[PDB]
Amino acid sequence: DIVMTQTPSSLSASLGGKVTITCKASQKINNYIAWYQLKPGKGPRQLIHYTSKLQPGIPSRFSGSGSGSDYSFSISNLEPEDIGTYYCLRYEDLWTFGGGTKLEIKRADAAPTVSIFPPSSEQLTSGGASVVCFLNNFYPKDINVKWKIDGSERQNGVLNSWTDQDSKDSTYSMSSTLTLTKDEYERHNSYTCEATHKTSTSPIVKSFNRNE
Amino acid sequence: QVKLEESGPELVKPGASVKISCKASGYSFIGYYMHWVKQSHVKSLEWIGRINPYNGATRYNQNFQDRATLTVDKSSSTAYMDFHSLTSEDSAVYYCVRWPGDYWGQGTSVTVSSAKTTPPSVYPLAPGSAAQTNSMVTLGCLVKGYFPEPVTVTWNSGSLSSGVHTFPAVLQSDLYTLSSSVTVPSSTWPSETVTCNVAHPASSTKVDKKIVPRD
Ligand code: NA
Questions:
Q1: For residue A126, which residues of chain B lie inside 8 Å, CB to CB?
Q2: Which of A88, A109, A182, B78 is the most exposed place for a label (fewest CB within 10 A)?
Q3: Ligand 1 centre and the CA of B132: distance in Å?
């Protein structure tokens, strides 16, 4: 194999802005480079082939250039939908993909909207008890969640999940779920979800009493 | 119009093999090389190899060469990828793609696991308090204990799209769990119905869960 060194591996830029990705081959590849866009839930979409030729329907704000072993790719007038991961490809015959560049849209900071949910009566009937906390539409993506049962931190039984960046409002969301047996859920009463985000030194606290 | 139509999702036990097909139409199949590409979250996009359909000559990524075999059925315009001795690291979406990389199949999801196909349990997420007399209300439903991926979640059969977040599934044991949220005006719920529709094609299950206030 050859090496296709794609750089940088991560991009963060503003709407209407411009970004540029470098792809450096370990030897001359004679302009047989292509650039792809990969969005979640979609297959790879070839934007540019043969260094600089756009594919049908691709707008001119996508551009590519280079020669020998140094190649570049640029997106101007960034749109929220441009979020995704971009790859160079040496496609002449033996293929080599670059490592990929993940593109983030920069935007104003936003505190998360935090919601906590008791276990449903339907789940408790089955012997289980999941406490769900949503932390929706925040920016930037860095965030930490703490669970407290009767004012005591809890780490076992917690599952976290983070969305990709929203293609519309450029925010992030995450879910934190504490799953217990029904027996363990009933011997405690106060369940607290605490979100710590850059937007405030003070955490956002949501909780409920099991006995309503 | 070039089309590459791949076979459906595959659930394979560890150590077993899988064979994926890719039916080409709209061009001379024996004329263009067929490539295969692996897409995973842990390894991004990896080339598997290519085949010249005319003579069957193949080239492989050295990482796959000992376990992957590319073949073609010339008379039926179909290309195959045979992958032996799979492990969980081989769970990924596999694409066939025609040279020069402009036409792609829709992809075949391969899950390598010993878990059995299992329908989800769907639980409502209603707030544990009364809504303020004029506020925005966040609801949801918990989709727990299904296999394999994926499930689809909509709200009111797609009529509620505002403020919807369906989070990526996480493995809770041998089974997947996710939640989906939706935010609606307090004037809309509970005076109007809010229902999350959960679909799990692998088990032919379609569940509607109406979200009702707690007490
Ligand atoms: Na350029």
A1: 121
A2: A109
A3: 54
